[PDB]
Amino acid sequence: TTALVCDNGSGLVKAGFAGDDAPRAVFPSIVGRPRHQGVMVGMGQKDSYVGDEAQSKRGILTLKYPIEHGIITNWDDMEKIWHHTFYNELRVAPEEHPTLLTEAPLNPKANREKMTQIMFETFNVPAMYVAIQAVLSLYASGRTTGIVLDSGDGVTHNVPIYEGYALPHAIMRLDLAGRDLTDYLMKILTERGYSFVTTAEREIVRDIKEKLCYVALDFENEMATAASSSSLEKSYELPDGQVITIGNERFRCPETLFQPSFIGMESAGIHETTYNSIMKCDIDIRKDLYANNVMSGGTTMYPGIADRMQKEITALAPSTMKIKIIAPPERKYSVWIGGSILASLSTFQQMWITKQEYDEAGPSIVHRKCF
Amino acid sequence: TTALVCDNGSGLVKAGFAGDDAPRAVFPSIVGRPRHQGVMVGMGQKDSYVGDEAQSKRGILTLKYPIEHGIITNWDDMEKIWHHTFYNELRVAPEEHPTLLTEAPLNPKANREKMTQIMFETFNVPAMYVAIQAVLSLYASGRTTGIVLDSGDGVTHNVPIYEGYALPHAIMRLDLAGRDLTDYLMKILTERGYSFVTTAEREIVRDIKEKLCYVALDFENEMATAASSSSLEKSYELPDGQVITIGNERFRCPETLFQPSFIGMESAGIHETTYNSIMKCDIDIRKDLYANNVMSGGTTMYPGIADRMQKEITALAPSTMKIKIIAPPERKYSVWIGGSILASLSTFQQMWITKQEYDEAGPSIVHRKCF
Amino acid sequence: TTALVCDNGSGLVKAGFAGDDAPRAVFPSIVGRPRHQGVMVGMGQKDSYVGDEAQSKRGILTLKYPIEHGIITNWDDMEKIWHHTFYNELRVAPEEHPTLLTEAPLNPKANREKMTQIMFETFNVPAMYVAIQAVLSLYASGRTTGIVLDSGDGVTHNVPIYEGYALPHAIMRLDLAGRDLTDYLMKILTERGYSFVTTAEREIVRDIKEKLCYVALDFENEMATAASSSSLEKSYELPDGQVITIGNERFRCPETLFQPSFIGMESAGIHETTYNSIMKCDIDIRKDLYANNVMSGGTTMYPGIADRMQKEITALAPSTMKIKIIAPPERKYSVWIGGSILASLSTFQQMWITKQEYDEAGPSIVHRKCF
Amino acid sequence: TTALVCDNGSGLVKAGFAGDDAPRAVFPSIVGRPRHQGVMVGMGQKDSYVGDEAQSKRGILTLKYPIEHGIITNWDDMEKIWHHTFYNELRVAPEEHPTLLTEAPLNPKANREKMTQIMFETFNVPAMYVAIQAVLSLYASGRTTGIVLDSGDGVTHNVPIYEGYALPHAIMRLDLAGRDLTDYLMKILTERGYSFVTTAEREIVRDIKEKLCYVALDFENEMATAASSSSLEKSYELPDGQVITIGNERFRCPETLFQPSFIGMESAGIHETTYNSIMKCDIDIRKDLYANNVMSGGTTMYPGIADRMQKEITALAPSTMKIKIIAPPERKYSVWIGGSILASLSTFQQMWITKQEYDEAGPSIVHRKCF
Amino acid sequence: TTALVCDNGSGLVKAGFAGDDAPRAVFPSIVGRPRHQGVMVGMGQKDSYVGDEAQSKRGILTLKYPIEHGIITNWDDMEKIWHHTFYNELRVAPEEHPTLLTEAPLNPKANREKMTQIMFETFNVPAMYVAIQAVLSLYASGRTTGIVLDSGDGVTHNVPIYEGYALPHAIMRLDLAGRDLTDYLMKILTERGYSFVTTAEREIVRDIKEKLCYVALDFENEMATAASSSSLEKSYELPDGQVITIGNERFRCPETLFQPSFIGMESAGIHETTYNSIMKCDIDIRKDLYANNVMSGGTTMYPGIADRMQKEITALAPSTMKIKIIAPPERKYSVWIGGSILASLSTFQQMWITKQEYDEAGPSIVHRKCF
C-alpha cells in the first residue's frame, strides 16, 4: 500500500511514508563505535551506536559515515542504519511496504546493485525503486524543466532536465560538498587558533558551519571589511562553554564552493559547473534552463548562496538570459519530498522493481529502468 | 461542401478551407522524436512531437522532415502530420470534406499514388485532387500566362503556362532550394566561427536566414564592400543570448540560388534555369513569358531576389523583351491561395477524384487527370 | 554464593558481604609491633597486633601501614591483615566465597598480581576480582557518568567515566592524600608548639584532623580573620588531658589539597587536577562531566571541601558550564558500597576470575579483564 | 632551403624537416601552469611548463590545450608551444626556413589568419603555407583518390579527393574526436568505480585509452559476452600502483565513434559520416571513393577500427561496391608525413606564401590559395 | 651580512649562523622558576633560569615550555629565551643580522604575527623571515620532492612537496609528538613501579626515552617476546643512583606514534597520516612521493622508526610503489640545516621581510609571502 520513501543520503537519513509532506525519521548517517575500552559491567553497553544514539554518545565513539562522496562504502554499517530506520525509527514492517531509495547520478553501478540486493534479501522488501536525487528534487519544486543543483554532504551535482527529459551527457558531478566544507573549517579554524581534530569535533564543526557560515556576495570585498572591522566577528558556544570567535572563516568556508582551489580541488566552482552543464545542453533549451535553476540540498541552505550564484552565473551567461534561481524553503528535504510525490503517483506504480522481477532478471534490472 | 486545401509542402504545412483568403493552420512539417531517454515518470511524455510541438521541444528532439526535395519519404511521419493537420489544427472531420493536395511537378509517380491511397484509406476523404503547386501559384496571381518560379524549402521549379496551357516539356526542376540554403549557412557560419550542428541548430539557422539574408544586386561588388566596411555586419540573437555577428554570409548564402556551384551543384542558377525554360518554349510566346515572370514560395521572400533576378534575366534575354517580374506580397502562401481559389471554382468541381472513382479505376486515376 | 567485598584501602580496611548496605568489618590497616622489650612473662604477649588491637595498644607499638600511596609494600603484613579480616572480623570461611578487592588506578601491575596470588594461594578463594575504586564509587552514586574524585589516605585520583566508558588517558593520580595531610599537621602543629613525633602521635593527629579541620572557602581571607580574632581557635583533648589549641592550622592543613606546594608537592591542587582531567576528555562530553563531579573517599569528608572545590572549578571552567558536585552522605564508604552493588549484579558474575582460570592462564589474567 | 613541417595538431605537436620520414619533435600540445602556490625559493620554478615538461610535472599543473576541436583558442599559449617547438625541440632558427602548418578543413578563417600573422611577425618565417590535414594524409598514402578520414584528438573529418580534386561540398566535419572519447572514459570509468577528475587524471585516462580500448566488431554481441565472462576484463597500472580493472568500457568507449549518441552527440557515427560524404559526391566517382577509404590520425589506431568500419560501410553501401579501407602503419603521423612529402615537391615551391607577398596582399592571401 | 638561523622549536632552541653546517647554540626551550622560597641571601639568586641553566638547577625549578604543540603560548618566557639565544649563547648583536625563524605549518596566524612583532620591536632585527620547518628539512636533504615527516617534541607534521611546489591541502598535522611520548612514559613507568611526577622528573624521563626506546618492527610479536624473556629488559641509571629496569615500555612508548589510541588520541598513526597525505596528493605524483619519504626531527631518531614505517606504508601502499624512506644522519637538525642553506642562497635574499617593509605594510606581510 504505502511506500517508504527513504532518502539514504550521506549525512542525514531521511525516511517517511509516501504521501507525507515531511520525513518522520530524520537522523544522521553515522555509526559510532566505542573509542575506549569500557568498564561498567552492568551498564548495557552496545558494540555500536547509530544515528541519534551516536550523537548523544559522540565523544566516546569513533564516528563513521558509511557513505562517502555519495558512495556506500561500509556496507555492514549501512545495513545497520537501514535496520534502525525501519525498525526503530519508523517502526514499520519493511516486508509489507515498497521502498524508494535514492542515488546521486554517476554513482558506481555496484552501489545500486549491492543496495538492491540488501533491500530484497535482508529486508524482504515487496518492491523497490532507486531514483536519482536531482530528479526527485525537481518533482518537489513541481517543475518539468530546470537545472537541479543538488548539493548535500556527500556530493554536489547538476542535472539538466528539460520537459521531463534528463540530459545525461550534461550531468555534472563534483565531489566537493558539505563534508569537505566541514573539513575545510577544521583547517581554517586551526588558523584562527582552535584545534578541532576528532570525529566528534568534526561533528561540532558541522554545527558551527550551519549557524555561522554565509556566502559573501563579493568575496574579495568581504575580505577587505572582514580584515578591517570586527562587525563580522561572531561568537559561538561549543558543547564545552569555550566560546569560539569566528570572522573571516564565516565566509571563507562556503566560498570554497565557488573557489574549490581553496581545498586543492582542481574543478571549477559550482557556478561554473552549473554553467558548463548548461553549455553542454543544446542551445535550443538553454534559455529555459537559465530561468529554472533549482537549488536544493543542505549546502544550499547557506545564507546568500542563491544571491551569490545568481550574480556569478549572470556574469557567465549572455546578458539577456534572465538567470533565475529557485531556492524554496524546505529545499533541504526536497529530495525526500520529491520521493513522497513520486511514490504517490499512479503512473509511477509501474516503475517498481518487484522481488519476483528482480529474482528473475537479476541485478542488471536496476539500471535497465533508469541510469 | 467546403474543401480543405492542404498545401503539404516540405517545410510548412499550410492548411485551411477553400474560400478563405489565408490558411488557418500553418505549422512546420516536422516530426520530432526524443533525442534523450526521459526520466520523469508522470510527465506525460510523447513518443513523437509534431509541428509546433516539435518546435517548442526542439532541443531534445531529433527533427525529421518527412518530405525531402519535394518527395515524401517518411510516409509514417507524413501520415502523422496530416493527422494533426486535420484533427488538432483545423479540427475538422476529414470524411465530410473534399481535399486538395499539392505537388511539385516531376515528383515520382509513387509519391502521388501513395499519398492518394492514404487520403482515401486513412482519412476516408470523400473526394480528393492533387494539383501542381506552380499552377496554383499562377491562379493566386490571377494570371493565365507566365513563368511560375516556385521555390520552397524542398525544391525550386519553373513551370511555363501560356493562356491556361502548361508546357510540360519546358518544366524545370532544381533541387537546390531553401533547405540547401539553410545548410549552406550552417557551413558558411562555421567559416565565421559558429558551430551549428544539430537539427535543432539547423532550425535556428533557418530563423537566421529569414531575418538577415538578402540578395546582393551585384554579388561581386557586394563582396568588395563587405570585405571593406562593417556596415553590412549585422548582429543576431539566438535562443541563447549568444549574439551572432554576420556579414558576408548575409548575401553569400542566397547567392547560391544564382551560383549553385557554391554548394557543388552543377546546375545553372535560377536566373538561367528560368531563362532556359523560356528558351524551350516556342518563340511565339516567349515575349509574354518574359513579361509575366511570377515568383512565389518562401525563398522568393529574400530582399532583392526580384531585383536581382530581373537584372540577371535582363542580361540573358534579348534587350527589348521587357522583363517583368511579379512578386506580390503574400506570395509565400500563393500556392495555398491558389488552392483556395481553385477549389472554390464551379468548373473545378468536375476535377475531383471521388472515393468511388478511385476504388473503381485504381491508383492510375491520379495521373490520368493531370501530370 | 555471597561475595566478600573487601576494600583493602590504605588506612581503613572495609570488608563485608555483597548485598549489605554497609561493611561489617571496618578497622585500620595497621600492623603494630612492640616498640619495647616486654617483661611480663605470662601476659600472653603477641609479636604483632592488628587493626583495632594496634589501636588499643598503640603507644607501645611501632605502627606500620602495609600500604603506602595505594601500593601494598609490606606484603607480609598485608597478608596478616587479610587473615584477620576474614577469620577474626568477618569470621567467614574465605574458601567458600568469591571476593572483590580494589585498587587505585595506575597502581603497579605487580601490586595486583601479588595480591591475586595471595587470594588464591593463601586463602583459596573460589573466585576473585579486582576493581578500580573510582569505578566502584560511581556505582555507589548510581551514575554512569561523572568525574570520580576518590581521595583516601593513600592516594587521590580522578577517573572520568562517561556512560559506562572509563577514559584511561585522562585518569589523574596524585599521591597527595590523607596521610600527607596528617603529616602536614604534625609539621604545622610543631609551629604552634606541639611536638607530635611517634607513629602513635601521628595517629593522634589523624583524630585531630578529622574533627577540627575544615576547608576555607577563601583561604586568604580566612587567614586574615584567623590572624585577627580568636573565633577560629578551637580546643582539642588528647588521650592525655593536655588540651591542644588549634587555629590557623584548622584550615591550613586541608588547604594543601588545593595548594600542594605547601608540602613541596609540584602538582597542581585537586581542583586543577580534576579540571585538567576533564580537559583531557573530548569536548563532546565535558559538559556532562562538569555536571557530575562525584566526590568520595575519606578526605572528601572535610567540611566545605565540596563548596570550595565548586568555587575553584567554577573559576577554572567556562562560565555557563554548570559545575555540580556530588558529595553524598556515606561517600566515605562509597567504594565499598559500590563493591557490594557490583558483586550483587547478575551481569557481573561473568567477571569473576576463577581459581581454575587463574591457574590455567596465569597472573596476566588480572589485567586482561580491566586495567 | 629545408622546410620545417609543423603539424600543429590538437594534442600532439609533430614537427620536423621536410625530407625526413618522421618528425623529430613529437610532444603534446599542452601548456601547464602551477596548480599550487610554490614554496621552494631557489628551485628555479617556471610560470608555465610546455609539452614534455608539462607531462613530467603534470600533477601540480593545470593542463590546458591551446587547441580545442581543431581551433586555436588560447593564442598566447599556442605561441609558446611554437616557440618551444622551434627553439628547444628542433633547435632551428625559424627565420631561415619556410614552414608548413596544417588545419582541419572548415576551421574558422580567423584561425588561419591569426596563425599566419604569428608566423610572419613573431617568428619571421621567410615563407609559409597552410595545408589541409586530410589532403596531406592522402599524399602520405601516395594516392590521388580517396576518402580521407582523419580523426585526431580535436576533430574528425572526411575529405573526398578525386584524382587530385578535393570536393569541398562533401567535406564532413565532426567534432566528436579523441578528446571526447577520453572524456567519455572518465565518465564511464566513474560507472565502474574510478574517480578520474583532474586534468592530470584526464591525461592518465588518455594513456588507458590508448592501451586497452579496442573496437568491437559487433558491439551488441560484444556486450553480451562482456557481461557474461571475465575474459574481456583487463588490468591497468596507474602512475600510482592502484590497478584499474576495465571490461565493458574497453569497447564502449571507442564505440562512441559509431554511436555518438553515447555522449549526447546528435550526429551520425563516422561510418555514416563517411558514407554520407560519398553520397554527396557525384555517382560517377563513388566507386573509386569506396575502394580508397583512407584512414589516418591517432584515433584510427584503435584495434579493429578498420574492420569495424569496413563492416559498417559494407552494410550501408550498395553491395558490389567493394569497400576497401586503407589503414597503413604509421597513419598516426600521416599528416606530418604528407607535409614532408609536399614540402619536398618541386612543384609545391610555388605555393609558398612569402613574407613579402603577405605584407603586400594582407591576411586574405592565406585563403586565396586553398580553402 | 650573515643571517642568524634560529630554529625556535618546542624543546630545543637551535641557533647559529647561516653558512654553518651546525648550530652553535643548542639548548632546551625551558624557562624555570624557583619551586621553593630561597634563603641564602648573598647567593645571587635569579628569578628565572633559562635553557642549560634550568637544566643544571632543574630540581628546584618549575620547568615551563613556552611552546606547546608548536604554539608559542608563554610569550614572556619565549622572549626571554630569544634574549639568551642572542646575547648569551651566540653573543651576537641581533640588530646587525637578518634572522630566520621557523614554524610548524598550520600554526595559528597570531603565532607568527606576535613572533614577528617581537623580532622587530624587541630585537630590532634588520630583516626577518619565517619559514616552514618541513620545507627547510627538505632543503637539508637536498631534494625538491618528497614527503617531509617532521616530528619534533611539539608537533608531528607531513608536508608534501613536489618539485618545489608545496601542496597545502595535503598537509597533515598531528599534535601527537615527542612530548606526548615522554608523558606516556611517565604513565607507563608508573605501571612498572616508578613514580615520575615533577617537571624535573618529566625531563629525566626524556633522557630515558632517548636512550632506551626503540621501535618494534612488529609490535605484537615484540610484546610476545618481551613478556617471555628478559632479553629486552634494560637497566638505566637516574641522576639518583636508583637503577630503573625497563622492558615492555622500551617499545610500547614509541609505538604510540603508530597506534595513538594508546594515549587516547583519535588520529591514525603517523604511517597512516603520511599515507593519507599522499592520497590527498594527485595520483600523478604519488609515485615520486612514495620514493622520497623524508623523515626528520628528533622523534625520528628512534631506532628502527624508519624500518617500521617502511613496513607499515609498504602494507598500505599499492605494491610496486617502491616505498623509500630517507632518514639521514643529523636529521635531528635538518630543519636548522635547511635554514642555514636557505639563508645562504642568493635567490632567497629577496624573501626577507625588512623592518621598513613590515612597518609600512603591517603584520599581514608575514603571511603574504608564504602560508
Ligand SMILES: Nc1ncnc2c1ncn2[C@@H]1O[C@H](COP(=O)(O)OP(=O)(O)O)[C@@H](O)[C@H]1O
Ligand atoms: N542550515 C544549514 N546551513 C548550511 N549547511 C547545512 C544546513 N543544514 C544542513 N547543512 C549541510 O548539508 C549537509 C546535509 O544536508 P543533506 O543534503 O540532507 O545531506 P545528505 O543529503 O548528504 O544527507 C551537511 O553538510 C550539512 O552540514
Ligand SMILES: Nc1ncnc2c1ncn2[C@@H]1O[C@H](COP(=O)(O)OP(=O)(O)O)[C@@H](O)[C@H]1O
Ligand atoms: N522571409 C523569408 N525570407 C527568406 N526565406 C524564407 C522566408 N520565409 C520563409 N522562407 C523560406 O522558405 C521556405 C519555406 O517556405 P515554403 O515555400 O512554404 O516552403 P514549403 O512550400 O517547401 O513548405 C523555407 O526555406 C524558409 O526558410
Ligand SMILES: Nc1ncnc2c1ncn2[C@@H]1O[C@H](COP(=O)(O)OP(=O)(O)O)[C@@H](O)[C@H]1O
Ligand atoms: N570525617 C573526616 N574528616 C576528614 N578526614 C577524614 C574523615 N574521615 C576519614 N578521613 C580521612 O580519610 C582517610 C581514610 O578514609 P578512606 O578513604 O577509607 O581511606 P582509605 O580508602 O585510604 O582506606 C584518612 O586520612 C582519614 O583521616
Ligand SMILES: Nc1ncnc2c1ncn2[C@@H]1O[C@H](COP(=O)(O)OP(=O)(O)O)[C@@H](O)[C@H]1O
Ligand atoms: N595507439 C592509440 N590508440 C588509440 N588512440 C590513440 C593512439 N595513439 C594516439 N591516439 C589518440 O589520437 C589522438 C592524438 O593523435 P593525433 O592524431 O596526433 O592528434 P592530433 O593530430 O589531434 O594532435 C589522441 O586522442 C590520442 O589519444
Ligand SMILES: Nc1ncnc2c1ncn2[C@@H]1O[C@H](COP(=O)(O)OP(=O)(O)O)[C@@H](O)[C@H]1O
Ligand atoms: N636520540 C633520540 N631518540 C629519541 N628521541 C629523541 C632523540 N633525540 C631527541 N629526541 C626527541 O626529539 C624531541 C626534540 O627534538 P627536536 O626535533 O629538536 O624538537 P623540537 O624541534 O620540537 O625542538 C624531543 O622529544 C626529544 O626527546
Ligand SMILES: [Mg+2]
Ligand atoms: Mg541528499
Ligand SMILES: [Mg+2]
Ligand atoms: Mg511550397
Ligand SMILES: [Mg+2]
Ligand atoms: Mg579508599
Ligand SMILES: [Mg+2]
Ligand atoms: Mg591531426
Ligand SMILES: [Mg+2]
Ligand atoms: Mg623542530
